């Protein structure tokens, strides 16, 4: 009957926003369309550095702290001399030093969402000029190649140290006295143990705040490193658009899918939510057992050692 007013009132609160916000969002399809031109531009010119390689070297960062390497920066460790002396970043300040970094999160800079080769060889900046010295005392995000890693673990007793620091200062440290990244022939299986840690055993002890069948499919230990061109996940599905790596952003020992996700997608401020991610999933530098699926961090590193 009288429903004929929605023609002069209810509607007058419709095209008044379907125009509005479709405009005040039209001005987004603007900014967020030039800033891409304005950084794509200041991308025409690559960045550079000068890590004057210091004298002191060694087999790995341990022997190098056992050779006077007391400052933390870009060193040149050379494992079995049946290989090439690859630049690396040593930690010789926290925990008796000798900590050879493998991965490092502290800001954007490096797209960790790569493939096979890159994850195997390595990518990123192993270090940057300390802004006022010759060498490179400040670390930059990278993934010291897998192959390089699977070899370092292969030096008998390899013990990785996984640290993180959440945006509000606070920080915790994980740890697996026993760590071993098989060789690429094994799809790079990850064997970890001797877990100790105040950050939650998210690699083997699966994701805590959950339950059985849902949890254990958040165990990385015994997993086959994967990347969006190498489906070695735990997620069995004929559907190729759905794989633990194509989602969750990056390469990781994926087991349907993760209780921890360093190497995810870099999230600023930490907190983030599905309605933000490329695939809704909880992709990003997340360590679930300490912060849960919806909290990426500031810095997420991984330093190993022998013994």
């Amino acid at each position: 009957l009288y429903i004929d007013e929605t023609v002069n009132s209810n509607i007058p609160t419709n095209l008044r926003v379907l125009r509005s916000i479709l405009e005040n969002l039209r001005s987004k399809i603007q900014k967020l369309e030039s800033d891409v031109s304005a950084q794509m531009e200041y991308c025409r010119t690559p960045c550079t550095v000068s890590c004057n390689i210091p004298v002191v070297s060694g087999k790995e960062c341990e022997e190098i702290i056992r050779k006077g390497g007391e400052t933390s920066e870009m060193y040149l460790i050379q494992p079995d001399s049946s290989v090439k002396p690859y630049r690396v970043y040593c930690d010789m300040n926290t925990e008796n030093g000798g900590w050879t970094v493998i991965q490092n999160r502290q800001d954007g800079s490096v797209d960790f969402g790569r493939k096979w080769d890159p994850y195997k060889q390595g990518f990123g900046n192993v270090a940057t000029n300390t802004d006022g010295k010759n060498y490179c005392g400040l670390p930059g995000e990278y993934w010291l190649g897998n192959d390089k890693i699977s070899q370092l673990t292969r030096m008998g007793p390899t013990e990785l140290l996984i640290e993180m620091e959440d945006w509000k200062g606070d920080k915790v440290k994980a740890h697996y006295g026993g760590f071993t990244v098989q060789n690429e022939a094994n799809k790079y299986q990850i064997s970890v143990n001797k877990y100790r840690g105040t950050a939650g055993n998210a690699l083997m002890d699966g994701a805590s705040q959950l339950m059985g069948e849902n949890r254990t499919m958040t165990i990385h230990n015994g997993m086959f490193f994967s990347t969006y061109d190498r489906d070695n996940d735990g997620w069995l599905t004929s559907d190729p658009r759905k794989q633990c790596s194509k989602e969750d952003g990056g390469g990781w020992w994926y087991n349907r899918c993760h209780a921890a996700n360093p190497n995810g997608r870099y999230y600023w401020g930490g907190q983030y939510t599905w309605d933000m991610a490329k695939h809704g999933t909880d992709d990003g530098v997340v360590w679930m057992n300490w912060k849960g699926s919806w909290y990426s961090m500031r810095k997420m590193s991984m330093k190993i050692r022998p013994f």
């Binding site: 994701a207 949890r215 499919m217 899918c257 993760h258 909880d282 679930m288 699926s293």
Partner: peptide, 4 residues
């Protein structure tokens, strides 16, 4: 995060 796991998968359903």
């Amino acid at each position: 995060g796991p998968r359903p």
